[PDB]
Every structure is written in structure tokens, then in C-alpha cells.
Design a protein around this ligand. Sequence first.
Ligand code: HEM
Ligand code: HEM
Ligand code: HEM
Ligand code: HEM
Ligand SMILES: [Fe+2]
Ligand SMILES: [Fe+2]
Ligand SMILES: [Fe+2]
Ligand SMILES: [Fe+2]
Ligand SMILES: [Fe+2]
Ligand SMILES: [Fe+2]
Ligand SMILES: [Fe+2]
Ligand SMILES: [Fe+2]
Ligand SMILES: [Fe+2]
Ligand SMILES: [Fe+2]
Ligand SMILES: [Fe+2]
Ligand SMILES: [Fe+2]
Ligand SMILES: [Fe+2]
Ligand SMILES: [Fe+2]
Ligand SMILES: [Fe+2]
Ligand SMILES: [Fe+2]
Ligand SMILES: [Fe+2]
Ligand SMILES: [Fe+2]
Ligand SMILES: [Fe+2]
Ligand SMILES: [Fe+2]
Ligand SMILES: [Fe+2]
Ligand SMILES: [Fe+2]
Ligand SMILES: [Fe+2]
Ligand SMILES: [Fe+2]
Ligand SMILES: [Fe+2]
Ligand SMILES: [Fe+2]
Ligand SMILES: [Fe+2]
Ligand SMILES: [Fe+2]
Ligand SMILES: [Fe+2]
Ligand SMILES: [Fe+2]
Ligand SMILES: [Fe+2]
Ligand SMILES: [Fe+2]
Ligand SMILES: [Fe+2]
Ligand SMILES: [Fe+2]
Ligand SMILES: [Fe+2]
Ligand SMILES: [Fe+2]
Ligand SMILES: [Fe+2]
Ligand SMILES: [Fe+2]
Ligand SMILES: [Fe+2]
Ligand SMILES: [Fe+2]
Ligand SMILES: [Fe+2]
Ligand SMILES: [Fe+2]
Ligand SMILES: [K+]
Ligand SMILES: [K+]
Lengths: 156, 156, 156, 156, 156, 156, 156
Amino acid sequence: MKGDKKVIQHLNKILGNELIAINQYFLHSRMWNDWGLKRLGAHEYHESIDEMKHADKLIERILFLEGAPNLQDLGKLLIGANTQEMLQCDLNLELKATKDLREAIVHCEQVHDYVSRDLLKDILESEEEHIDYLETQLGLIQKVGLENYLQSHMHE
Amino acid sequence: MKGDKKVIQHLNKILGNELIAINQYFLHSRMWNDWGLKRLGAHEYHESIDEMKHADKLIERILFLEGAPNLQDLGKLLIGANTQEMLQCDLNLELKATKDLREAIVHCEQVHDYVSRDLLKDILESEEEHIDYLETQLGLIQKVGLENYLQSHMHE
Amino acid sequence: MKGDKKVIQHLNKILGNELIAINQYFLHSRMWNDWGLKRLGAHEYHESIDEMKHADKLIERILFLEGAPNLQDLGKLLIGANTQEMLQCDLNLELKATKDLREAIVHCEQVHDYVSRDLLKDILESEEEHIDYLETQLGLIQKVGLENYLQSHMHE
Amino acid sequence: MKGDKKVIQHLNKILGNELIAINQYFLHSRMWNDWGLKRLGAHEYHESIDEMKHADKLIERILFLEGAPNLQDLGKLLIGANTQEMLQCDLNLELKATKDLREAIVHCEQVHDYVSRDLLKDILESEEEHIDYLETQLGLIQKVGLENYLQSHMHE
Amino acid sequence: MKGDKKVIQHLNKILGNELIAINQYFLHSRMWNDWGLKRLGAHEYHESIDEMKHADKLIERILFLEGAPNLQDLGKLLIGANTQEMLQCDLNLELKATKDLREAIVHCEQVHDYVSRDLLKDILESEEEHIDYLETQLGLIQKVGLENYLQSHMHE
Amino acid sequence: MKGDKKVIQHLNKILGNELIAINQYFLHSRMWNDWGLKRLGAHEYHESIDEMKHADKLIERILFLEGAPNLQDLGKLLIGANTQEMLQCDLNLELKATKDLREAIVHCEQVHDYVSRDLLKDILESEEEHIDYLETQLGLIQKVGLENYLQSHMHE
Amino acid sequence: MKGDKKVIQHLNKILGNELIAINQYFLHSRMWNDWGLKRLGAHEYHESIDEMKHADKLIERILFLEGAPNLQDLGKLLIGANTQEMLQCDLNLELKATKDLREAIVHCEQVHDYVSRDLLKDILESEEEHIDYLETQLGLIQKVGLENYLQSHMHE
Ligand code: HEM
Ligand code: HEM
Ligand code: HEM
Ligand code: HEM
Ligand SMILES: [Fe+2]
Ligand SMILES: [Fe+2]
Ligand SMILES: [Fe+2]
Ligand SMILES: [Fe+2]
Ligand SMILES: [Fe+2]
Ligand SMILES: [Fe+2]
Ligand SMILES: [Fe+2]
Ligand SMILES: [Fe+2]
Ligand SMILES: [Fe+2]
Ligand SMILES: [Fe+2]
Ligand SMILES: [Fe+2]
Ligand SMILES: [Fe+2]
Ligand SMILES: [Fe+2]
Ligand SMILES: [Fe+2]
Ligand SMILES: [Fe+2]
Ligand SMILES: [Fe+2]
Ligand SMILES: [Fe+2]
Ligand SMILES: [Fe+2]
Ligand SMILES: [Fe+2]
Ligand SMILES: [Fe+2]
Ligand SMILES: [Fe+2]
Ligand SMILES: [Fe+2]
Ligand SMILES: [Fe+2]
Ligand SMILES: [Fe+2]
Ligand SMILES: [Fe+2]
Ligand SMILES: [Fe+2]
Ligand SMILES: [Fe+2]
Ligand SMILES: [Fe+2]
Ligand SMILES: [Fe+2]
Ligand SMILES: [Fe+2]
Ligand SMILES: [Fe+2]
Ligand SMILES: [Fe+2]
Ligand SMILES: [Fe+2]
Ligand SMILES: [Fe+2]
Ligand SMILES: [Fe+2]
Ligand SMILES: [Fe+2]
Ligand SMILES: [Fe+2]
Ligand SMILES: [Fe+2]
Ligand SMILES: [Fe+2]
Ligand SMILES: [Fe+2]
Ligand SMILES: [Fe+2]
Ligand SMILES: [Fe+2]
Ligand SMILES: [K+]
Ligand SMILES: [K+]
């Protein structure tokens, strides 16, 4: 079905953010597992999988709308050197992603692509849950202390 | 069955205390959940449900006794800003509530409303369990340290 | 995540309508039970639970957006003295509440809080089902007669 | 297999009556449901489904006989404004349908299309059960009174 | 264990009331069954059984306290002539019986017979439930009309 | 609940498109079954049932909003003579129908009928899935050849 | 455990090839699904998943060896425009990848990193299986014809 060219460009931009998130979260997950922080690693792995699922739905929609999904252009991964930085790197990524999602939704609405809008709203709800998770972890580090917070995420 | 007018006023006063506790504990539960302290949040939620059940029983008794349950007047909620304050606010409210229950029970005994006395003694048993839980939590914060106490209440 | 201050005001206004509904429908449910109209009583109880779940979702959203849920201010309960009045009182409250939901949705759209919009739309769908239930009951009272209508709602 | 042109014309005429009944009865069903008369609504829905099944068998037989099923021409729906009128509209429609079925059966017999006759006879049996149902409800309204009759058909 | 003579007197007085209610409710039950009002007859039968269980517990207590249970003196049965009168007769009996229960509890409390007091409170709780049932049925007759009320209690 | 008159006109217009599609796809389904192309006939039957479900939800929404569902007006069925034409006729109907859905949604949004908007968006999502199916089949005909495509849809 | 720097370089080079293959195959899978060639789509999906698992193991080994996995430098995706081109692009990628694997294995053997050699040998077995699959499909296209080959891969 012939889609709006600007919508497709937006969909491809959201896809680009997912592809960053996939790799960033996967690496952070394996870094935490490597350190023995297996509960943090397991949770970060599931964040990664969520983004893989987002990317898949974006790819399917771009192809239905007769555009070309861009999986070639991989933007800058934000890799931290410790748990506190890793969480904040993820949270910086998510905040930038939600800004792009909101702008894409505005454009879908303007050209009446309501099905793409709905897809993007679904992704956005998930990213806001991710933001909640990240803010909540950083807040817990402050309330319980870094050492306790890491202790609590050693064993699954 | 026409009840004693002052007994009914006592029952409405107990009901008013229940309505404060429902809202205060429900908000505290959701604050704890929002902070990622989900074991505290789940326990406070069950305390809130406990108060909803007390209110229900009082409402039904007031109606049986041909009174008018007052769900309109909501007294002051005591909303803490951190875990220590939230526990102490709940404890302050429980202590005021039990004082009112004791006076209601004196009046029921005086006019021979033994069934209302029984209902109020059941509520009071529950309130003293609530007090024991709150006092114990505050005690545990001093024995294990606030950061340890909060750590132990992160995960269900 | 930092929410829009006027969206948060809108959410607290919707929450305030929910808190009226919880108390109004709970009291009506227990009044119908007390009269032995158990089928009305049970249906109204489940309406009350619906509103408790709406309030919980609003409370959680407000807190995520870093606002303060307002559970302190309780508006006017509309309590009737018979089945016809109680149904019309509920219907009056739902119509007022849907007006506030629509204005809140307008604001969420204006500032691109699409997740809050979605949540309010979900609540709005529920309220329109509540309206449909209430209008239908008032219509059945006209079609079958009041005494028949009440007879059919005596027994669960 | 090449059918008789006038038989196929008869079959298309019966189908056209089925198409009126599907729509008329589906609308009456949803109106009854809308008014909270859910037992009437459910039973009319099932009458609707029966007519859909009649239409299906007629379409398959027309195509086997190398005819062209006519789903384009929709005759006049008879929509009532209250229960008594809706039942009478349905009955009026059934009685016209059975007149057409009988004439179709005569023609099938005359040209030895015995399998078509058998299908039409099966449909006619169902229409006569529909007629019995409708006549019987109208009699019950008279015997038990309209308000009682509607009361008995509120709840499934 | 030697009981207080006046407590035992009180218990025999309560037992006397139980014996009236057993026969009164049993007869009313069989009258309603005989008339084909089986739902009323079944519920009245269960009230009779309740009173039989009360009598059993009073007999057992009197014998433990080394008194002599009095099953010989049967007070006046109030037998109604129609459903309304029968419910009112039952309600008159219950209200008179709760008056004697309260005076017995006062005396139990006065001589520290706290176990007998607890037994009488449990009975009194059952009697207020019986009162609620009877009051509610009389109220339902007013709200739905006598003929509707009886119709709804023909079939179990 | 009194709805917006132009919204109801839009819903009745969507309903009109559903009624065309019901009959068109049902006839196409039975044509495919009659030719022994049973996998195409079964899938087309399921499209037809999807449309009946859309029609049902529209009818229910129109009645709730106190409008009059129009099941009387049946637009022009596009009936093809072979598989390729039938698929294109269906595709042409869907593309016309999504146009009317988009315009109906614009109007719902403008008058704040957010529940009607959500219902139409759900229908639109389904229609775009239908378009995807149709376009894909026409594409497979080109990629595998007509004879291979038909062969693959003989047997369920 | 400190690993050989040049081994880690080899592992990151292998990882770079996995990352290309993941994206290329995932996009080829979804292109096939979009065209209705769903057997090809599912199989290419599972190839993509295989590469994700190769990547994971490489990432884990690199971290264990105190290296930094490189997920940032995504090489050129080879995207075909039709089934034959897509298969050949995949085969070209696999053949380049196996040459890098053989060179990495030589180096692991030279420095006695026999655990790394074993992991690479397991990956190599899988790539050779991937090569066999792809060569076989290209051969079948020649033996059965392109249209037959695609036909056979439409339905799962
Ligand atoms: C460095 C890049 C990637 C890595 C390491 C990776 C890793 C993984 C792993 C380990 C799994 C679980 C496989 C299993 O054991 O079942 C998985 C699943 C999956 N991947 Fe990836 N992945 C990557 C990139 C991608 C991309 C770019 C996409 C899509 C565009 C994607 C789509 C999926 C999907 C759909 C699943 C299955 C999710 C489900 O459970 O439903 N992946 N990935
Ligand atoms: C007059 C005030 C209230 C009364 C009498 C009341 C009563 C009740 C009762 C009887 C239950 C079922 C408890 C059980 O047996 O499990 C319940 C459940 C619940 N209440 Fe309340 N409630 C009140 C206010 C509230 C408020 C203000 C909120 C939230 C802001 C709330 C949230 C809930 C929730 C979430 C549930 C569980 C619902 C479920 O089953 O999923 N309630 N309430
Ligand atoms: C106003 C037009 C129509 C409406 C609203 C309607 C509605 C429905 C609904 C709601 C169902 C149940 C679907 C499910 O939940 O599985 C159904 C089933 C069905 N419909 Fe219709 N329908 C319409 C027209 C037609 C026509 C014109 C035909 C045939 C000529 C037809 C044939 C069927 C058949 C065969 C079934 C399956 C029934 C069974 O075996 O249970 N429908 N319809
Ligand atoms: C001193 C007077 C009476 C006492 C203490 C007494 C006690 C009891 C008790 C303890 C039961 C068992 C109830 C249960 O736990 O389910 C019972 C059952 C019953 N009683 Fe009595 N009762 C008395 C008089 C009567 C009378 C006067 C009638 C009838 C005219 C009656 C009719 C019945 C019946 C029909 C049952 C059910 C027995 C069954 O299971 O078939 N009772 N009674
Ligand atoms: Fe995402
Ligand atoms: Fe396509
Ligand atoms: Fe834009
Ligand atoms: Fe969605
Ligand atoms: Fe995310
Ligand atoms: Fe955690
Ligand atoms: Fe360990
Ligand atoms: Fe309480
Ligand atoms: Fe009462
Ligand atoms: Fe007092
Ligand atoms: Fe008790
Ligand atoms: Fe309490
Ligand atoms: Fe604890
Ligand atoms: Fe609500
Ligand atoms: Fe937060
Ligand atoms: Fe506003
Ligand atoms: Fe939602
Ligand atoms: Fe509501
Ligand atoms: Fe009853
Ligand atoms: Fe028919
Ligand atoms: Fe044929
Ligand atoms: Fe004829
Ligand atoms: Fe037959
Ligand atoms: Fe019929
Ligand atoms: Fe009902
Ligand atoms: Fe008794
Ligand atoms: Fe003894
Ligand atoms: Fe005494
Ligand atoms: Fe007891
Ligand atoms: Fe009693
Ligand atoms: Fe549709
Ligand atoms: Fe309505
Ligand atoms: Fe318009
Ligand atoms: Fe929805
Ligand atoms: Fe469609
Ligand atoms: Fe065959
Ligand atoms: Fe690989
Ligand atoms: Fe290590
Ligand atoms: Fe080397
Ligand atoms: Fe190995
Ligand atoms: Fe490979
Ligand atoms: Fe197919
Ligand atoms: K009646
Ligand atoms: K072939």
C-alpha cells in the first residue's frame, strides 16, 4: 500500500534508534553478566529483546508501505564503564528516542496514517516503561547505596 | 432495626477514620511501588485493602441500624515524603483510630449493642496488628540500618 | 520522567472524579444490598471496583510524571433515596466525568503526551459503557415497570 | 450442471427474501440488546444466523446449477419501533417468504428438480418454525401482559 | 462446673424463646410449602434449623453449669394467616427474643460468666441477621408489590 | 448517549461499505469453492466474517449514540469473473473503504468522540491487513504464475 | 583472564561479520514474508537467529578475555532485489565469513588459545551448514524452475 514518503522517513529514523538500543543494551547485558551481576544482565537482556521486537514491527510496516527499511546506518552506541554510567547511558538513549517518536506521531496524524500512529504509540508506551525502569534503578542506588544495589543484582 | 443514635455516630466516626486510612495507605503503596520498593508497596496495598474491608462492614452495620453512612467527609491525609515518615504517619493515624475505637466500644457496651461491640473489637484487633507491623518496621530500620532495610524491601 | 504541569492537573481532576464515583457507587451498592436488591447491589459494587482501578492507573501515571496525586479533596457525592434516583445520580456523575476526560484528552494531544492520552481514552471507553448501563436500566424501568424491574433485581 | 432457468430465478427470489431477513433480524436483535432486552436480542440473533445459513445453501445451489446468485438487490426492511411491532414485522416477512417458497417448490416439482425441491422444503420447515416462534410470542404478550413479557426477556 | 443460679435461669429463658421459634418457623415453613411458595418455605425451614442449633447450645451449656434445661414450657406461638402476617409474627418474636438476650448478657457480665456471655452474643448475632432478613422481606413486599414478591418465591 | 449527528452519518457510511464487502466477499468465497479453489474460498469466507463483525460493532455504536443504523442501502458489488479480477475487485473496495474511514476519524477527532475514533481505527487496522493480503496474492500470481498460484489454493 | 590481543582482534572481526549477517538475513526474511513467501521468510529468520547466537558467544568470550567487543562498526549489507539475488548475497557473505574464521583459527592454534579455537570451529560448522543450505536452494531453483521453487516456499 503506498505510504507517505515522510512517514516512511520517520519510521526509518525510529528504526535507527532501535538498532542503537539493541546493540547498546545487549553489550551492557553481557558486561553485567561478565561481572557476575546476573540479575542486571538478565533484565538488560530483556530490554534488548523488546527493542528487537520494536525493530521487527517497524521493518514490517515500512515494507507494507513500500519503503526500504534502513538497517545499514548504525548511530553512536553509548557504552558506560560501570553500572551507574551504563544506566544513565541507556536513559539518555531512551529520552532521545521518545523525542523522535513524538515527532513521528505528529506527522502520522497530519497525513492521516492512523495505523502507523498506533504502532508508534505502542512503541512509545514501552519506551516510557523503559524510562521508568531506568529512573527507578538510579533512584534506588541513591536510596540503598551502590554496594547494596549491586549486591541485590548479583544472583537471579 | 433502629439503632442507638449515638452508637451510629460512633460508627460513622470509625468509618471516617477508615476512609482516611484507605487513601493514605493506597497513596503510600503507590509511592513505594513508584520508587521501586515493591515489597513495601505490596504490604501497604494489603493494609489499604484491610481498611476497605473495615469500611464495608461499618457501612453495612450503619445501614442495618437505619443510619446514614457518611462517605462525604474526608479528614486529613498524613502523606510522608520518605519511608521513615510514611511509616510514622501511618502509625500516628492507627493510634488515633484505636483511641476512637475504644470510646465507641465503651458506648456500645453501655447501651447493650453487643453485636456492634463485637464488630468494633474485630476491627480493633486488626488495627493493633497494623500498629505492631508499623512499630516493628521502624524498629528494624534501627537494627539493620535504613539502607539495608530498604534493600530488603526492593524485591517481592 | 518530567511531565507537563497542566497534564498533571488534568489527571488530578480526573482522579478527583474517580474518588467521588468510588464512594458514591460503593454506598449505592450497599444500600441496594441492604434493601435486598442484591442483583443491583452486585452490579453497582463491580462499577465501584472499576472506578478503583481507574484511580489506581491515574495515581501511578501522576507519580511517574513526578506529580503529587491528590486523594485529599473529595467532591459532592450524589446519593439518592430510591433505585430510580440512585441510577440517575450515577448517570449525572458519569456525564460530568466524561466532559472532563475529553478536555484532558485535548490537552494531552496538544503537548504530545500520547501515553497519557491512551490511558484516558481507555478510561473514557469504560465510562461510556457505564453510561450505557445506566441509561439502559432507566429505559427498562419505563418498559417493564418499576415494580417488575425491582423484582428482577432482587435475586442474584 | 445446467439447471432450469426458471428454477434458478425462483432460487434467486428466495435468496432475496433471505437477504431481507438477515438484515431486518440482525437490526432487531441489536435494538433489543441496546434496550437491555438481551433474551429477545439473543433469540433474534439466532434467527438472523439461520437466515444466513439459508442464503448460503441457496447461493451454493445456484452456482452448482450454473446460475448467477443475486446479492445486489435488497428489498425493503420492515423495522419496528417497539417489541410488538418488530415481532409483527418479522411475522409479516416470514409469511411472504413462505408464499414464495411454496411457488418455488411447485416449479421444482414440475421440472423434476427434486434436489432443489428438497432444499426448499428444508428451508420451509425452518420458516414454519420461525412463524410458530413469532405467533407464540405475540400470544404470550396477550396472555401474560406486555410488561411481564418484556421483564421475562431482559436477562438471558 | 457450678454455674450461677440466675445465669442458668436466664439461659432457660432464652431456651424457652428458642423453643417457640422452632415450632413457629417450622409451621410457617410447611404452610408456605403447602401453598407452593417453596422458596419462602425453604428459607423459613433454615431459620427453624438455626433455632434448633441455638437450643442445642443452650441445653449443653445449662447441663455443664449443673442446671436443669427446661423443654417443658412452651410459650405462645404466633401463627399468621398469610405471608405478610407470618413475617410480622416472626419479627415480633425475634425482637422480643433479643430483648431477653441483652438482659442475659448483662447478668453474665455482672457475675463474670464470660463464656456464657460469648455464647449469647453469638446467638444474638444470628438473631439480628434473622431480624434483617425479615425486615428486608417486608420492605421488598412494599417495593415490588405483594403479588410480585410471592411470584418470586414460588420456585426454588 | 446523544452523539454528534455528523459522526453518526459517518458511521452509517462506514456501515454501508461493510455491507457491500460482506456480500461481495461471501459471493466470491462461494464462487471459489464452486470452482474447487477451496483455500481461496475459505480465506475469502473469513474476510467476509471479519466484515460482518465490523458491521456489528458499527450498528451497536450507532444505536448507543441514539442513531438509526442503515442496513437498507446496499451499494454496488464488484463481482469478478476469475481469480485475478476477483482479488482486484476486493482490493478496489478496500481502498475506497479506507478513504471513508480516514475521513470519519478526522471528524471524530474534531468533535472529541474519542471512543468512536478508536473503534474506527480498529476497523482501519483490519482493512489494511486485508489490503496487505490482497496485494500480496496479486503479487504472488506474478511471481509463481497464475496456474501455480491456483494449484496452491485448490486443497485446504 | 588476559587474552592474546591479536586473538581478540580476530574475535572482534568474526563478530563484525555476524553483525552484518544478522541484519542482512533479518531484512531478507521480512522481505520474503512481505511477498508472501513465508517458508523462505521463516527459514531466513532462523538463520538470522543463528547469527545472533554466534554473536552472543563471541561477545562473551571477548569479555572473558578482557577485551572490548565492538558492536559499533557495521559493515556493508548485501541486499538483493529478488529471491535468487538474495540467496546469492547470503552465500557471498557466508563465503567471506568462513575465510575470516579459518584465519582466526590458525591464530588461536599458534598462541595455544584452544578454547577460542573450539568456539570458532563450532561457528564454522554452522556457517558451512548455512553454505550448504544456500547452495542447495540455488541448485533446486535450477532443477525445479524458479516459479515452482517459489510456489513451494509460499506456504509454511
Ligand atoms: C548484535 C545484534 C543482536 C544480538 C546479539 C541479538 C541477540 C539475540 C538473541 C540471543 C536472541 C534470542 C535467540 C534465542 O536463543 O532464541 C534474539 C532474538 C531475537 N532477535 Fe536478536 N540480536 C541482535 C539483533 C537483532 C536485530 C537487529 C533484530 C531485528 C531487526 C533482531 C530480532 C530478534 C527477534 C525478533 C528475536 C526473537 C524475539 C522473541 O523472543 O520473540 N535481533 N536476539
Ligand atoms: C469508600 C472507600 C472504599 C471502599 C469501601 C472500598 C472497598 C473495596 C473492597 C471491599 C474491595 C475488595 C477487597 C477484597 O475483598 O479483596 C476493594 C478492592 C480494591 N480497591 Fe477499594 N474501596 C474504597 C476505596 C478505594 C480507593 C480510594 C482506591 C484507589 C485509589 C481503591 C482501590 C482498590 C483496588 C485496586 C482494589 C482491587 C480491585 C481488583 O479486584 O482488582 N479502593 N475495594
Ligand atoms: C448485515 C449483514 C450481516 C451481518 C451484520 C452479519 C453478522 C454475522 C455475525 C456477527 C456472525 C458471527 C461471526 C462470528 O462471531 O463467528 C455471522 C456469521 C455468519 N454469516 Fe453473517 N452477517 C451478515 C450478512 C451475511 C450474509 C449476507 C450471509 C450469506 C449470504 C452471511 C453468512 C454467514 C454465515 C454462513 C455465518 C456462519 C454462521 C454459522 O455457521 O454459525 N452473513 N454473521
Ligand atoms: C427441642 C426441640 C428441637 C431441637 C433441640 C432440635 C434439634 C435439631 C438439630 C440439632 C438438628 C440437626 C440440624 C443440623 O445440624 O443440620 C435438627 C434437624 C431437624 N429438625 Fe429438629 N429440633 C427440635 C425440634 C424440631 C421440631 C419440633 C421439628 C418438626 C416439627 C423438627 C424438625 C427437624 C427436621 C425436619 C430436621 C432435619 C433432619 C434431617 O436431617 O432430615 N425439629 N433438629
Ligand atoms: Fe524501542
Ligand atoms: Fe506488499
Ligand atoms: Fe515530520
Ligand atoms: Fe496497536
Ligand atoms: Fe526502549
Ligand atoms: Fe531489581
Ligand atoms: Fe554467587
Ligand atoms: Fe481499619
Ligand atoms: Fe434494613
Ligand atoms: Fe460515646
Ligand atoms: Fe465477630
Ligand atoms: Fe488500620
Ligand atoms: Fe519485611
Ligand atoms: Fe472512572
Ligand atoms: Fe519515577
Ligand atoms: Fe487544558
Ligand atoms: Fe492503552
Ligand atoms: Fe464510571
Ligand atoms: Fe428472596
Ligand atoms: Fe430463511
Ligand atoms: Fe460447477
Ligand atoms: Fe414458477
Ligand atoms: Fe432433507
Ligand atoms: Fe425465516
Ligand atoms: Fe439486569
Ligand atoms: Fe434463636
Ligand atoms: Fe458435667
Ligand atoms: Fe438478671
Ligand atoms: Fe464466639
Ligand atoms: Fe431467631
Ligand atoms: Fe470492514
Ligand atoms: Fe441506549
Ligand atoms: Fe465530516
Ligand atoms: Fe482499542
Ligand atoms: Fe475489509
Ligand atoms: Fe483434489
Ligand atoms: Fe555466524
Ligand atoms: Fe572477567
Ligand atoms: Fe592472525
Ligand atoms: Fe565446543
Ligand atoms: Fe552464517
Ligand atoms: Fe495462500
Ligand atoms: K412480574
Ligand atoms: K507446480
